[PDB]
Symmetry: C3
Subunit: 155 residues, 3 copies
């Protein structure tokens, strides 16, 4: 067997195929030759591993895009929340201011209701002193007129 | 075995080529290769296959995590919309409750100010009645006194 | 060499390389020997698949971290949303309590104003009667005085 470290089936630039080769053992100790059908079988797996890596890559890109979409929506939630927070605060201000000035107009109106009840009391006093001054006057015109009348009939 | 090919057998009676030393594995190698070299590669391809299947599972779990998040985000959207709507409902209840009270409070404003025009009309009509009583009692005293003074009739000196 | 199931190019421990082997047919029926550049081409693809699987594992690991950080924004939004739910119900009750209290004040002012109307009316009726009593008393003492002197010039 030619060449003493090597068995040659041609020369550089004039290579030969080796044909009618039985398939060899495929193991970590095999020193059998390998034929093309054995490389083909392996290449079929590799192709399938490659097609599968491509499908996973497409999947992983879309997952990443969905995560970014979800992030966009979390941030719209945040804005909406801040806006509700702000509208609560302005609605807080508008409640007490409005009730504050409803309460100021209640106190002004009680002040003049209290003044009106005072005047009604005072008017009611001097209205009863009048009902007496008018009946003591009425009695003393009667007494007086008929005392004078009495000194007329004395004649 | 011409000068295109070399044959170790025939169809149906192929032969294994045995005691083959490992050949150079490079992009110009014209060496035969042996079965432990193909074995070495096939082990890597097995490992890659196994690793793709682990990776697939992780991708599957990630997808389930993402849909969990989506579900919570949707719950946040709902509650936010319920808050948004309670706030408008409260804002419209507060406008109608203040305006109804400010309306009853200004119908009182007006009816009280009419009571003050009436207390002023009573107070100075009552102040004429006081001076009418005085000038009435004065003219009574003055009119009886001058009748009594018409005793001049009966005057035994 | 030939041992009828095998062709030998060496022996155990003194195996030889076959050289100047032209590329065999790669196909599922092929009985061509394969050479080193044919296995090298395939291993190149296996290396790329291995590189791709690692990159993808790294990408999938960053998305897992991304997802985790978003979880934390979601639970913060839930805190904020809950705070807002409380503040709104707290504000609802303050608004109800505040406008109920102001309503009480307005009814007790309405009470003392229609009493003021009842009393201002009563005063006016008692006051227009005084206008009655003062004018009749006037022309009743006018009538009394002028008949006493009507009779006292009868002398
Ligand atoms: Cl959210
Ligand atoms: Cl692979
Ligand atoms: Cl909210
Ligand atoms: Cl009043
Ligand atoms: Zn990508
Ligand atoms: Zn064998």
């Amino acid at each position: 067997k030619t060449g003493n470290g090597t068995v040659s089936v041609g020369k550089k630039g004039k290579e030969r195929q080796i044909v009618h080769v039985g398939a060899g053992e495929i193991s970590d100790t095999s020193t059998d030759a390998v034929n093309g059908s054995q490389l083909h079988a392996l290449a079929t797996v590799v192709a399938q591993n490659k097609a599968d890596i491509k499908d996973l890559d497409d999947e992983v890109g879309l997952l990443g895009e969905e995560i970014n979409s979800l992030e966009g929506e979390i941030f719209n939630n945040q804005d909406a929340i801040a806006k509700n927070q702000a509208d609560i605060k302005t609605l807080e201000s508008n409640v007490e201011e409005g009730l504050l000035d409803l309460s100021g107009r209640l106190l002004d109106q009680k002040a003049d209701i209290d003044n009106n009840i005072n005047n009604i009391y005072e008017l009611a006093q001097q209205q009863d002193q009048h009902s007496s001054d008018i009946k003591t006057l009425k009695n003393n015109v009667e007494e007086g007129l008929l005392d004078l009348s009495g000194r007329l009939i004395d004649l």
